[PDB]
Symmetry: C3
Subunit: 136 residues, 3 copies
């Protein structure tokens, strides 16, 4: 199911030195996000670094949100995951998309400029209207 989402490019490397995000296939659930870096960042075991994407989105529809997830292989094989574990992007967030990258393993890992380092999915969300009860 498709939804138009505004995207703003913040760094001129985007598109020029690595591509914009695209779905691998029409059956893909997520979009891979790439590290927008002047220089490679070497992450020792246990450390966290904030990696820019050079991108901002504005979802705008309050019935939609995005969730940022680790990449499967990076996480399983290399211990490279997200420092906030899963990163929620609200419909009114219009700042740069930033990736909290955490090395949860025992091996150092260097993030190269342009490397795919997380994925993003778009999911419908609901806002609860709470009904206060004193017994269910």
């Amino acid at each position: 199911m498709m939804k138009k989402i505004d995207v703003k490019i913040l760094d001129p490397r985007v598109g020029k030195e690595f591509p914009l995000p695209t779905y691998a296939t029409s059956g893909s659930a997520g979009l891979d996000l790439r590290a927008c870096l002047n220089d490679a960042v070497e992450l020792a075991p246990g450390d966290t670094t904030l990696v820019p994407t050079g991108l901002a989105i504005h979802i705008a529809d309050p019935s939609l949100a995005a969730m940022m997830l680790p990449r499967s292989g990076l996480g399983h094989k290399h211990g490279i995951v997200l420092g906030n574990l899963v990163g929620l992007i609200d419909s009114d967030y219009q700042g740069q998309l930033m990736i909290s990258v955490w090395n949860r393993g025992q091996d150092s890992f260097t993030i190269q400029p342009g490397e795919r380092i997380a994925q993003m999915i778009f999911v419908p969300v609901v806002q609860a209207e709470f009904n206060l009860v004193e017994d269910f």
Copy 2:
């Protein structure tokens, strides 16, 4: 998109010493959940503690669920995340909402009473009816 959800308050501090959960804005995807504690809890690196919220919900609609996520800043900047990483709340769960708080970093952190320590989103869910095949 809005959905009525029953909520029961379990601890008289809720509302009295810190507020009920509310959406920051009409475009917010998540609700911040606060620690309902008699005393602050100091979490050393690597440890996990179970924090009550003083709240129970009963979603009741089987086409909806809630997911509990870390807060972005706490997770990235402070290494304070969830011990179960993401916590799924089923439509028929009517117990207290409990937060597994894990210090995944290298600095001790004290959870103050009333402090926002996780977020909750409501998402539609589907139940699979499996169709057994012996080749796709």
Copy 3:
């Protein structure tokens, strides 16, 4: 809400030595997935192992995806979570479902054959059609 999903069994132990996945109740959001193992696997603190399920699904609908999550108790009480934290299954994935199991705690844990070790939810997903703007 129900959706037909094709499932293929890859290992003859499935159904014979432990059951196929089922929803506990009609209000359950997730399905527990079991370890399909010839022998128990003992996971020391910090290590990760790739556990087969003996199962493959083919969601096929591009408006649906699955997310693999830790079990709540395993994660909170035992530090047994997913090495990729959350595992996304695309609508066109038709390989075996594999579970990255990570011991994020301080106690060794042995995964027994047939033991429930993760959960899977099915959620609607949206594919973004990006609209390039140079200011929001």
